[PDB]
C-alpha cells in the first residue's frame, strides 16, 4: 500500500485527486446504467487492483475492475476521506443528537477545520457529486442514496460498531441534497 | 494570518510552495552576496510584508524580500517543522544525545503518514537555500551555524541542551546537503 495521502495527491486550485477523477469519469462512461455496479466481486485481487492504481487509459479496463479499484482506492488511502477525528466526534454524540441536519451541519464544520487539509473536504465533495449522478439513473443501476450510503460509508469513514446508523444516514442525505 | 497550510499550498510533483520559490529565487538573485542579508530589519511592518505575500518579486528591495521570507515562515498556520515533531525531539534524554540520532528521528517523524509530505519537502527546499547561502560565506558572512541560529526559531516555532540539539541538527542538515 503505497497510495499517498489525499493531501499529497493534489492541492488547490485542483478540485480532486487526478487518479480519482480518472476512475470516476471512466466508471461513469461505462457503468452509469449497470445494475450491479459497485456490488460485485470482480476477478482481480488487491495486488492486481493496486497495479492499476500505482501505475494507461482506464476506459480499457472492465467496468467491474474499475469499480473494484475505486473501492481499493478508498481502502488504501493512508487516512480515510473522513478523518477518524471527525468520525469519532460524530459517533460519540450519537445518543445525544438525533437531528440529521445538525449532524450534517457538524460534519461540514469538523471536516473544514484548519487542522485538516482542504483536500479531504474537496475529495468528499467530488465523491458525493459522483454518488449523486449515479442516483439520477437509479431506475436502471438500482443505486439510490440509501444503497450508495450503505456501500460506501464504511469506506469513507473506515469503520467495520452498532452506534453507527446515524453516520450512514448523513451520507444518504448528503447524496440526495446536491 | 491568512496564509494557507503548507499542505494546501502545493503538492507533489511540485517541490515547494510556489510563493516560497518566488521569494527564495528572488532573494538569491539579488542578495546572495549581501553581508547583512537576514541580519538587519527593513522599514516595512508585518502588515506591509503580508500585503506582498498576496507582480514579480525581483522588483522589491532585497531587505524587504528577506523580511517577507521571515514573515512567511512566521505566518504559516503550522511551522515548517510541526509541533508533533518538535515535541518528540525536545523530549529526548541525555543518553540519546547523538546528533546522528536526533536527525534520524526528525526524518522519521516528519516523514510520518500523519504529517503531509509537503512539510518535509518545504524544509528540504529551505535547507538547499541555506546551503547555497553558506557556499558564499566569504562574501555574505553566513555559515551553517549562524543560519541555524537565525532560522531555527522560525522553523520550529518553540532553552537547554535539548534546544541546543535542535539548532545543531539544523546546522548539520544545512552543511550536509551536498
Author numbering:
A (entry chain B): 113 to 167, 172 to 276, 280 to 297
B (entry chain A): 113 to 166, 172 to 275, 279 to 298
Q: Please, what does the article write about this entry?
A:
The BH domain can bind to and regulate several GTPases including Rab5, Rac1 and Cdc42.
X-ray diffraction data collection and structure refinement statistics for bovine p85α (105–319) mutants (E137K, E217K, R262T, E297K) are provided in Supplementary Table S1. In contrast, the bladder cancer-associated p85α mutants, E137K and R262T, showed a slightly enhanced Rab5 binding. Several patient-derived mutations within the BH domain of p85α can enhance PTEN binding (e.g. R262T) that may help to stabilize PTEN by blocking its ubiquitination. Further, crystal structure determinations for several of these mutant BH domains indicated that no major structural alterations were present. No significant differences in protein flexibility were observed for any of the mutant proteins, suggesting that the mutations did not alter the rigidity of the domain.
